[PDB]
A paper describes a structure:
Mtb Decaprenylphosphoryl‐β‐d‐ribofuranose 2‐oxidase (DprE1) is a flavin adenine dinucleotide (FAD)‐dependent enzyme, which together with decaprenylphosphoryl‐d‐2‐ketoerythropentose reductase (DprE2), converts decaprenylphosphoryl‐beta‐d‐ribose (DPR) to decaprenylphosphoryl‐beta‐d‐arabinofuranose (DPA), an essential cell wall component. Multiple covalent and non‐covalent4 DprE1 inhibitors have been identified and showed in vitro and in vivo activities against Mtb, further validating DprE1 as an attractive anti‐tuberculosis (TB) drug target. When analyzing toxicity profiles, we noticed that many TCA1 analogs show inhibition of CYP2C9, one of six major cytochrome P450 enzymes which determine the clearance of 75 % of marketed drugs. Here we report the X‐ray crystal structures of WT DprE1, a TCA1‐resistant DprE1 mutant, and CYP2C9 in complex with TCA1 analogs.
Similar to the binding of TCA1 to DprE1, the thiophene group of TCA007 binds in a hydrophobic pocket of the 2C9 substrate binding cavity that is far from the iron of the heme cofactor where the reactive oxidant is formed, thus preventing oxygenation of the thiophene moiety. The pocket is formed by the inner surface of helix B′ and adjacent residues and hydrophobic residues on helix F across from B′ and helix G above TCA007. Mimicking the role of DprE1 Lys418, Arg108 donates H‐bonds from Nϵ to the carbonyl oxygen of the thiophene carboxamide (3.0 Å) and from Nη2 to the thiazole nitrogen (3.4 Å). Phe100, Leu102, and Phe114 form a hydrophobic pocket together with Phe476 where the carbamate group of TCA007 is bound. In contrast to DprE1, protein H‐bond donors for the carbamate are not present in this pocket, but the cavity is open to solvent and an ordered water molecule donates an H‐bond to the carbonyl of the acyl group. The pyridyl nitrogen of the pyridothiozole group is oriented toward the heme but is too distant (6.6 Å) for coordination to the heme iron. Consistent with this observation, TCA007 does not significantly alter the visible absorption spectrum of 2C9 in solution. In contrast, miconazole binds to the heme iron of 2C9 and alters the spectrum of the heme co‐factor, and competitive displacement of iron bound miconazole by TCA007 reverts the spectrum of the miconazole complex to that of the apo enzyme. This portion of the active site is also hydrophobic, but a molecule of water is evident 2.88 Å from the pyridyl nitrogen of TCA007. The water molecule is hydrogen bonded to a second water molecule that donates a lone pair of electrons to the heme iron and a H‐bond to the backbone carbonyl of Ala297. In general, the extensive hydrophobic interactions and hydrogen bonding interactions with Arg108 are likely to form the basis for the high affinity, reversible binding of TCA007 to 2C9, but these interactions also sequester TCA007 in position that reduces the likelihood of metabolism, which is consistent with absent or low rates of metabolite formation or time dependent inhibition.
Residue numbers in the entry: 27 to 490
Write the structure that this text describes.
C-alpha cells in the first residue's frame, strides 16, 4: 500500500449518525453490563438515573410507586401550557385528572354506549374500508391510523367520521405532523446531544401551532356540549368532564377547568392514536412474515367466533393462541423502549443511593420485555413466549409494554380492546397476501427518536 501524495487529511466523510430509540436502548443495556442495573447518565450537569432489568424496575415503579410516579418538566411542553392534562401533569393535578379519566374510560358517566361498543363499530368500519381497497396492493398506514383516532373522537365528543371527511383529515394531519416532529431521531454535534428538529427552524413553532389548533377544535366541541349539558345524561368524555366541573364549583380552585379539559383531550389523541396505529401496522407485518401463526389465529377465530358476528372481548378468554400472538406482538416490537421519562416526587433512598426530588428516571422497558430468562430467545417473534408447555395462555409479570406502577398507560384496557378487536376482525374477513415472499420480507425497524417503527410494506387484503 503506497497511495499517491496529497494534502493533509480533511474532516471525516459520511460518518454522522441519526440515533434512534432502539440504539439508545442498546447503549443502555451495554452500560448496564459495566455499571449494573441502576446507573446515572450525566448530560452536562443534568443527571438521569436509568433503571435496567425487572428487579430494579419493579422495586422502583411498583414497590416505591408513589415516589417514582413523577413526570418532570419538558420546556417545549411548558410553552404550549401542556402541564394541565395527564401526560405532563404532576402531584395533585395529575392524581385527580388521571383518576377521573381512568373511570370515564371504564364506562362511568359515559352513558349506555360502552367503550367496547364504540371499538366494535370502528372495527366494522375498518373492515369496510379494507374492502374498498379491492384486494389490490395497499400501504395500510393511513387506514390503520384512522381507526384508533376515530375511537378517541367517539369517546371524547361522541362523533366518528368517514375516512374522507375533511374535518377528520385535518385533525389527523396535525397529529401526524406533531408525532413526526416529536419522535424525530437524535444526533450529536459538538458537545451537544439533541433531537434533530431542535435544529430545524419551523419545528418548535409548527408544534405549538398544531397544538393550539387542536385545543381550539376541541374547544369548539366543548361549546356545543355546553349548550345541552345535562347532569342526568352525560354521553362522552366532554360531558363527563363538564359535569365534574359543575360538581367542583364552590370548591375553587378546581383542578378541572376548560384548560384542563382541552389538554386532557389533546393528551388522549396524542397518546392513544399513533401508539395503537403503529402497533397494528407492526402486527400485520409480523403476520405476513409468519404465515403459520396467522393460519392458527384464523383457525381459532373460525372455531370460537365464526364469520356471522363481530368479535367481542368475551371471546379472548376462549382464544389463548390469538391472545398469545397479540401479547407477543407487543413484547417483541418493544414499541416504547424507554417508556416516557419519570422523575422522583421527593428525596428517596433507593438501595445504596439517595435520589433528590425531581431527578429524571429513565426506565428500560426493553430490558424487561426482552429478558432472556423469562423469554428465551427474546429477539425472536414467538407466540409461545406467552404459552406454557401445554399450549395454555401464560401471563407474565414481565409484560410491561404499557409500563408499570402508578403511571401505567391509562389507555391499557382500551388499547388491548383495539388490538384484539381490530386484528381479529381483519383476520375474520380477509386473508393477508404479501407481495414479497415471506422469507425475503424485511422486518428491521426504522430509526425513530421515541418508538420502534416498522419498515414500509404493502399487502393485499383478500376477502374471505
Ligand atoms: C398499543 C397501544 C399503547 C401502548 C403500547 C401504550 C404505552 C404507553 C406507555 C409506555 C406509557 C408511559 C407510561 C409511563 O410514563 O411509565 C403510556 C402513557 C399514557 N398512555 Fe398509552 N399506550 C398505548 C395506547 C394508549 C391509548 C389507546 C390511550 C388512550 C387513552 C393511551 C393513553 C395514555 C396516557 C394518557 C398516558 C399518560 C399517562 C400518565 O402520564 O399518567 N395510551 N402509554
Ligand atoms: C415526552 C416528551 O414530550 C415532549 O417533549 N413534548 C413536547 O415538547 C411538546 C411540546 C408541545 S406539545 C408537546 N408534547 C405533546 O403534546 C405530547 N403529548 C403526548 C402524549 N403521549 C405521549 C407523548 C406525548 S408528547
Amino acid at each position: 500500500g503506497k497511495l499517491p501524495p496529497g494534502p493533509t487529511p480533511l474532516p471525516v466523510i459520511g460518518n454522522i449518525l441519526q440515533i434512534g430509540i432502539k440504539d439508545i436502548s442498546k447503549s443502555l443495556t451495554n452500560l448496564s453490563k459495566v455499571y449494573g442495573p441502576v446507573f446515572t447518565l450525566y448530560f452536562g450537569l443534568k443527571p438521569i438515573v436509568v433503571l435496567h432489568g425487572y428487579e430494579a424496575v419493579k422495586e422502583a415503579l411498583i414497590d416505591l410507586g408513589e415516589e417514582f410516579s413523577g413526570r418532570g418538566i419538558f420546556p417545549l411542553a411548558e410553552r404550549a401550557n401542556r402541564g394541565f392534562g395527564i401526560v405532563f401533569s404532576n402531584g395533585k393535578k395529575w392524581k385527580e385528572i388521571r383518576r377521573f379519566s381512568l373511570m370515564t374510560l371504564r364506562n362511568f358517566g359515559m352513558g349506555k354506549r360502552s367503550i367496547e361498543d364504540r371499538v366494535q363499530e370502528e372495527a366494522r368500519c375498518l373492515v369496510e374500508e379494507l374492502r374498498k381497497t379491492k384486494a389490490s396492493p395497499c400501504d395500510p398506514t393511513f387506514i390503520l391510523g384512522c381507526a384508533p383516532c376515530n375511537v378517541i373522537c367517539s369517546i371524547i365528543f361522541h362523533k366518528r367520521f368517514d375516512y374522507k371527511d375533511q374535518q377528520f383529515l385535518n385533525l389527523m394531519e396535525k397529529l401526524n405532523e406533531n408525532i413526526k416532529i416529536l419522535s424525530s431521531p437524535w444526533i450529536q454535534i459538538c458537545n451537544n446531544f439533541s433531537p434533530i428538529i431542535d435544529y430545524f427552524p419551523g419545528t418548535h413553532n409548527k408544534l405549538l401551532k398544531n397544538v393550539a389548533f387542536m385545543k381550539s377544535y376541541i374547544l369548539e366541541k366543548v361549546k356545543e356540549h355546553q349548550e345541552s349539558m345535562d347532569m342526568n345524561n352525560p354521553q362522552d368524555f366532554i360531558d363527563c368532564f363538564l359535569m365534574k366541573m359543575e360538581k367542583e364549583k364552590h370548591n375553587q380552585p378546581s383542578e378541572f377547568t376548560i384548560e384542563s379539559l382541552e389538554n386532557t383531550a389533546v393528551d388522549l389523541f396524542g397518546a392513544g392514536t399513533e401508539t395503537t396505529s403503529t402497533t397494528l401496522r407492526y402486527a400485520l407485518l409480523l403476520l405476513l412474515k409468519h404465515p403459520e401463526v396467522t393460519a392458527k389465529v384464523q383457525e381459532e377465530i373460525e372455531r370460537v367466533i365464526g364469520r356471522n358476528r363481530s368479535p367481542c372481548m368475551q371471546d379472548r378468554s376462549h382464544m389463548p393462541y390469538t391472545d398469545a400472538v397479540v401479547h407477543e406482538v407487543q413484547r417483541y416490537i418493544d414499541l416504547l423502549p424507554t417508556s416516557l421519562p419519570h422523575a422522583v416526587t421527593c428525596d428517596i433512598k433507593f438501595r445504596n443511593y439517595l435520589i433528590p426530588k425531581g431527578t429524571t428516571i429513565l426506565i428500560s422497558l426493553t430490558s424487561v420485555l426482552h429478558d432472556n430468562k423469562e423469554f428465551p430467545n427474546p429477539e425472536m417473534f414467538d407466540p409461545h413466549h406467552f404459552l406454557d408447555e401445554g399450549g395454555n395462555f401464560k401471563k407474565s409479570k414481565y409484560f410491561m409494554p404499557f409500563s408499570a406502577g402508578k403511571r401505567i398507560c391509562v389507555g391499557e384496557a382500551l388499547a388491548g380492546m383495539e388490538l384484539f378487536l381490530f386484528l381479529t376482525s381483519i383476520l375474520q374477513n380477509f386473508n393477508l397476501k404479501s407481495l414479497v415472499d415471506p422469507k425475503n420480507l424485511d422486518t428491521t425497524p426504522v430509526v425513530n427518536g421515541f418508538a420502534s417503527v416498522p419498515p414500509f410494506y404493502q399487502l393485499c387484503f383478500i376477502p374471505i
